[PDB]
Symmetry: D2
Subunit: 341 residues, 4 copies
């Protein structure tokens, strides 16, 4: 029985547990523990009531067996007994006792090999850092691209970021068919939980500004991460991100120079075929004039807007949507499932 | 001559300093110190650029002397030199060296008599807590109502809340004229800084919810504060507050039972006359069809919308706007200037 | 069976059709025609993709048959074949040939007795105006309160408004138990389809102003409508509405003077009982600390927040949420289902 | 004095008349009439109260002199007396009698050479179409690029769109220095008046969706318009616009392939020099970490953000903000001021 734990019951952490229950196909592993710096009642409330994704279709009841707190969660013909912890320092967590095989590190505060190892010290056998690498990782993984490159010896793993999980497939596909000389990316991202409601002191002066009333351009970890996953693309791609006042969903605007003839038709035909043959698990395409909120609660790593494709000579722009929250949470579960044989 | 400090350079603290320069009349005191846990660069940036009230019209120079940091601010033909500090523990602040007559406590974290006295220990002669009292205050003041009841011996003072500054004049005016059996308050409030961008752990489960996408009912400190200012109204006034996704500006909806004949005409007439005589300093009245944005950057403590006044039988409702940041800020200055004679 | 038509395929019209498919229990009537001044392609897209309630879970195909446009919709193990019209003038619609028994009038534009009769003088046996009455009507019905009073002579019926469906029960339940001398209503409502995106010319100078950036007080049709269902409440209740920048869901504050002794406990116990017995189909009660987005897609006509119930003296206030789109659409279908004999 | 008139008192028309008063240098023509299909009381109300730009810092007085409605405006030590009209059809306007020299045609309705000439056959000597040309024009101008290229025989002029006036200088400057082979544009743009509060039928299926809750990709007239100004760029530039839920201010992201060596330093130094010489009136450069709301009420056509300049190989991105209302209203005044002798 593969045993997963979630460190950090936040936007991702919560949507991992939900996605475990909502998946059409039951996963061959169990979440047995969650740890957050917050009280079980706050976590249960936030788990049940979600501004972005709606009420949880199920029932959650708290029990105090031993001096241990459990969540009894019943949804979609599925049940789970989940231990709740409240330990800010991850080396003190009982991962030995609970027989934890994988830890989903979803706090954002423990992204260095050092900080992550603290879970291994605490008894976990493997750690997935649900964010970009800070210093070193054993592997950097985009599910549906290179998840078969995980070695059994590998203990610290990054599932990079959602922006990375969308950008890489696009770049792999386009570069393989046509050759990317160079490329530049603009991400139009919804508000994130680290921003400010009103103008407020913050380590980053741009993200200190009122989230609901501003367009805020800012840096992206997706490019550092993409270079780890695809080394040959070093010095051939940069980009940045823009926060705008919506609650969820993002897009990528990839502009690239092609190394061979391109048309709008051949680009869209290539992506449709890729989505049908090699990337069907994680990639879709739409021909409809849709907007961000139409992709809310979509499980795909990317959905391409074929009506947005543009070519002027050698230069081209493609455009893809993704649910930064749900897309990534599904990929976390997809990845965990991949370790079993 | 009189030397003021500001502890907490946020939406209140920053708009206090701005209001001092912008005031059409020069105040007789000077602001000579500011403290926040953030660095001077972050403080200057946020002081200059504001999502709500625009670019600061003036020059801000930072002087790093050997040990001390100062701001040299020049605006509207006035100049201030302002020592800048970064001390989380208010008792370690150099209020003695700097000869601080009044400290404005604008952090939200030092509302007890104990915590306010920490400024007194640091050397300050008087504290004004910029919030409702938590336990004991030597006086609880609404400028324009009972600001004369400040005794020269009084060392810890509360300037109550924005909401209170507006609610009290309404209750006083109406109670004096018609008599209030009881009243109930609904406040519609722009978002505040303590809220959450996305759904996130927080000690209020209602304010944990995404600020930009929800109507959020919640408690008001204004009711306990009113009972300190007007003790006769204990057991006769209750109310609550609603957060909605605007950036600034609030409204108060007050529903009361009159103890003598009321009409719409009579209520409006009384409110107009008070804004023209006894409350001309802090109170205004419009009959124009306005909306929240129109009161952005108004200094008045309340602006009555007379078109909204209603009466059925012995029950009536009135309505008033206020700029929750600017009005409050102005009334802190107005209070500090009342201490002198 | 009974044949229903929808005139005006907007927020209400579209959600009526959606709620027919989504209903747990199949309605014993069919929707056989829709009419809008817009092209079928615009209408199908908007039907399929909704910013507020998500993707339509089902398939929509367009057919041309003898110059007639039909929509074949399949969902929830149900199918409808729905003829599509584009006639701005109700008198020229084919209600006689389509054998329409009931027209849902959802345009906003035909609320007068005389305008609504244009559907009758085009072949329809009965018209439900999906709004408060303009002048007069044969009946004004709130489902769950007085749907049984519909007579066969009632050919023009008003289903009033969202706000009225929520208010009338509240006022009825509480008047019957404790007695209401008088009452005043404050509605907090999400933005509506008739507002302006930016400050623009408009009939109402308040709804002229930017929908996404303002608190906007405004009139409410609810009180006129309530007085037409409960004529004894003439002179005993008034109120108004406040638009705030959320996409959907509304709340009502009712402040009343009781005529007998009251406490918070007795009020909540009465409202829980009513939600369990007489009003169970249309009314719920929550004790949890929830926010607006938690009631998106709720079918209830009101959900009381009992944590919000206040009492001071003989004066009380109760608070209730409703999904202003989904509730109202479900009450329309529920009303039509009440006609079968 | 030269005599200007405004058809369409909207976001542009209103800001034109404001910009007249607020401008630091006095303009050497007068605005002597405005027309709109809304009544004068509405026009004055929207002119005095703005959700974006705040209260008009002046006085407006309506006078009736002989069945002629006039506005008497005072602000910034200046005066105007402006006749107000309410004429739906331009050929019926009294331009001959009022001796109109230029009409600022700011309705969005009369962009054809045919529809603009209706104002010529009604008495005016010259017309400026305040938008991209629909069919053809005597000249398409970007003030500060080709405004010297107006011939006195030109009667139908276009001042293109906001976006065109940020894009064209960028393209000109860069192409001239480094050579542009091809380029693609992304515009991030605040909501405009033509959008939808909620999902509503609309000519454009993207702009039909809720303006306040969506990222909305859409077309841009700027690429048509730029090719009328610079025909050599046919087939070499393309792009699109994204609407996000802010109220004002846009940004342009321009990706180009340079025909010669480029660095970030060299690009930034070119744009700085230009902003200090030939483009000083319309262009500025910042390297501060600012956000959209800091450029509200900036008179410039574009403010380049240095920190955003990226180069990879031969491909490069640049980014520039503009106030899509104020920048444009000021360039319309600047256009009229250039005509004189
Ligand atoms: N939200 C997205 O769209 C998205 C997508 C991909 C990756 N990520 C990454 O996921 C990480 C978390 O993001 P999020 O949106 O969930 O943030 P969040 O703030 O919603 O969640 C963080 C959680 O960590 C908890 N926490 C804080 N300190 C802790 C500690 N010492 N031990 C345990 N729990 C602790 C917080 O209480 C909170 O519940 C970040 O690195 C972010 O970059 C986010
Ligand atoms: N904003 C309003 O409308 C309003 C109106 C009336 C009263 N108040 C009250 O005023 C107070 C200030 O809140 P705000 O709106 O300015 O929010 P805010 O978060 O902007 O203000 C808090 C500020 O205090 C600083 N701070 C935190 N810990 C500190 C410490 N130990 N020492 C010094 N500075 C510290 C923060 O960095 C920040 O700048 C609160 O009590 C609030 O409830 C606010
Ligand atoms: N949305 C709510 O919360 C709510 C609740 C209760 C009642 N209502 C009422 O329902 C009515 C409709 O409001 P809505 O929110 O659906 O607005 P809406 O603008 O979304 O719906 C109006 C629809 O009518 C169409 N239309 C306009 N003129 C027409 C004509 N001559 N013939 C046919 N179709 C025409 C429009 O194209 C559009 O599809 C209004 O009276 C409103 O007060 C709305
Ligand atoms: N807002 C921007 O960012 C921006 C920038 C550049 C160009 N423009 C263009 O300027 C034009 C005006 O747009 P806006 O933003 O001012 O929109 P708007 O809808 O606010 O302005 C249109 C105005 O014209 C009035 N009107 C309508 N029909 C009329 C008629 N027949 N005669 C007279 N007046 C009539 C309307 O009542 C309204 O006052 C559009 O073509 C727009 O694309 C807008």
């Amino acid at each position: 029985m593969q045993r997963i734990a979630i460190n950090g019951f936040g936007r991702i952490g919560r949507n991992v547990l939900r996605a475990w229950f909502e998946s059409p196909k039951q996963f061959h592993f169990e979440i047995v523990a969650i740890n957050d710096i917050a009280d079980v009642h706050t976590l249960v409330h936030l788990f049940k009531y979600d501004s972005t994704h709606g009420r949880f279709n199920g029932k959650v009841d708290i029990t105090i067996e031993n001096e241990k707190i459990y969540l009894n969660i019943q949804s979609n013909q599925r049940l789970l007994k989940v231990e709740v912890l409240q330990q800010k320092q991850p080396e003190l967590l009982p991962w030995a006792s609970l027989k934890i095989d994988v830890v989903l590190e979803c706090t954002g505060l423990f992204r260095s090999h050092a900080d992550a190892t603290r879970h291994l010290e605490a008894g976990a056998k493997r750690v997935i850092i649900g964010a970009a690498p800070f210093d070193h990782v054993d592997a950097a993984i985009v599910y549906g691209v290179n998840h078969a490159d995980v070695k059994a010896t590998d203990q610290i793993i990054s599932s990079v970021s959602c922006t990375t999980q969308a950008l890489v497939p696009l770049v792999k596909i386009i570069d393989d068919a046509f050759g990317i000389e160079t490329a530049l990316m603009t991400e139009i991202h919804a508000v994130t939980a680290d921003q400010s409601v009103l103008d407020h002191a913050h380590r980053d002066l741009r993200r200190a500004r009122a989230s609901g009333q501003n367009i805020i351009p800012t840096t992206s970890s997706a490019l550092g991460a993409l270079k780890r996953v695809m080394p040959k693309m070093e010095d051939r791609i940069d980009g940045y991100s823009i926060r705008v006042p919506t609650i969820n969903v993002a897009a990528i605007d990839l502009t690239f120079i092609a190394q061979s003839p391109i048309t709008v038709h051949h680009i869209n035909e290539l992506l449709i075929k890729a989505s049908q043959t090699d990337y069907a698990e994680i990639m879709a395409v739409t021909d409809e004039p849709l907007v961000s909120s139409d992709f809310n609660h979509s499980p795909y790593s990317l959905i391409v807007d074929l009506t947005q494709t543009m070519v002027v000579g050698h230069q081209a722009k493609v455009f893809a949507w993704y649910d930064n929250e749900w897309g990534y949470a599904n990929r976390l579960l997809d990845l965990c499932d991949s370790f079993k044989s």
